[PDB]
A paper describes a structure:
The CHDL OXA-24/40 is prominently distributed in Acinetobacter baumannii and is characterized by the presence of a hydrophobic bridge comprised of Tyr112 and Met223 that covers the active site. Class D enzymes are distinct in that they utilize a carboxylated lysine as the general base in both steps, activating the catalytic serine residue in acylation and the water molecule for deacylation. To better understand the structure–function relationship between the carbapenem-hydrolyzing class D β-lactamase OXA-24/40 found in Acinetobacter baumannii and carbapenem substrates, we analyzed steady-state kinetics with the carbapenem antibiotics meropenem and ertapenem and determined the structures of complexes of OXA-24/40 bound to imipenem, meropenem, doripenem, and ertapenem, as well as the expanded-spectrum cephalosporin cefotaxime, using X-ray crystallography.
For the V130D complex, imipenem appears to sample two conformations, which are modeled at occupancies of 0.7:0.3. Electron density for the three distal atoms of the C2 side chain was not observed, and these atoms are not present in the final model. The main difference between each of these complexes is the placement of the C2 side chain, which regardless of conformation, makes few interactions within the active site. A single Δ1R tautomer is observed in the K84D complex, but in the V130D complex, the pyrroline ring appears to sample both the Δ1R and Δ1S tautomers. However, in both imipenem complexes, the Δ1R tautomer is observed, with a mixture of Δ1R and Δ1S for the V130D complex. Carbapenems with smaller C2 groups, like imipenem, would not be impacted as much and might therefore be able to sample the Δ1R tautomer.
Author numbering: 32 to 275
The structure:
Amino acid sequence: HISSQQHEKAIKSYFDEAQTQGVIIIKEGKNLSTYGNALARANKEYVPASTFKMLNALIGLENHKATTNEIFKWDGKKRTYPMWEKDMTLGEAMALSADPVYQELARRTGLELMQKEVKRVNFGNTNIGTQVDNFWLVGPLKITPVQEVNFADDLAHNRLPFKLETQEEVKKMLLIKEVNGSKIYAKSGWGMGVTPQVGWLTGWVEQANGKKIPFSLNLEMKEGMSGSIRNEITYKSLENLGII
C-alpha cells in the first residue's frame, strides 16, 4: 500500500540523515531498482576495496591455493587493527575483513593467474595492474554499483564460472545476519586510500521461501563516520521495502 514515492523519499532520507551521498541498488529477478540520495552513482566506477575479498576467495579456493579449514597464522607484526593480530581461516578473515590474510591469498595466486581469472569472470573494468597484493585498494581495478549487484546476483544463484562447491564454500563465509526467518549475506567495503573514500555493502537477502534478492549499497565515507552506518542504512532500506 506504500507509494513508491514514499519508499524513494524514506530511503533517500536514510542517506541524508547519515550526512553522506550514496545509492542502494536492489535487484528483483531481472529488474534493477536504484534508491538513495545520489542516484547517478549507480553507473560510476569506484575501487571495490574489501568487496574484492569475495572474488579473491573464489579464485584461491578454485585454484587450490587454500582450503576452507586452513589457518593463516598471524606473523606477529603489528597490524593496522588489533582484531587482525590472530590466526584465522578464510571465513574468519572474511568476517573481520582481514586484509593481511587476503593479501597472502593473492600472493599465492600470483599476478598472472589473478589477471587471467579476474578477466575470465569479467569483474568491473577487469584491470588489476602489476601489483598482485593491492590492486583492489587504490586502482586500477574499478567496478560500478550496478556491476557489484550483478556480481552478487551471480554468486547468490551459483552462476559464476567456478565449481558449485567453490561458490557454496564462499557463500557460507558471507552470512552476516538473520532477521525474522530471512538471511542476509553480504561483504562490506571501505576504500580509505582514494579521495573521496568509498563505502560498500554488497550481498543478498535469502527469504524464508527461498527467493534471493541481491543489493549493493555504495556511499561516500567521511572522516569519523562509523563503518556500521553501511549496515544501518542497508537494514533500514531493505526493511522499508519489506524485503526483510
